[PDB]
Amino acid sequence: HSQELLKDYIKRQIEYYFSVDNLERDFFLRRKMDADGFLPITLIASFHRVQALTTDISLIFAALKDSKVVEIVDEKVRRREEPEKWPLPP
Secondary structure (H helix, E strand, C coil), X not given: CCCHHHHHHHHHHHHHHCCHHXXXXXXXXXXXXXXXXXXXXXXXXXXXXXXXXXXCXXXXXXXXXXXXXXXXXXXXXXXXXXXXXXXXXX
């Protein structure tokens, strides 16, 4: 119980970054994607609103695994739906 609510806030914050509404304006995030849409999870962990909530990387991974919006492969995360649409030149 001790971290379940915290995990939900983290999950919702990260789902915002990967929302279409945010992605349409988030040129920084898109420049950090690889060509398949993947971003380092540690980059996401450094963002102010996530870091305010936690610095516990297992908790961040556990939150991402609870999401239908994103998917994790090893150290990286991407939007599940058409991730290839979003990357931009660095």
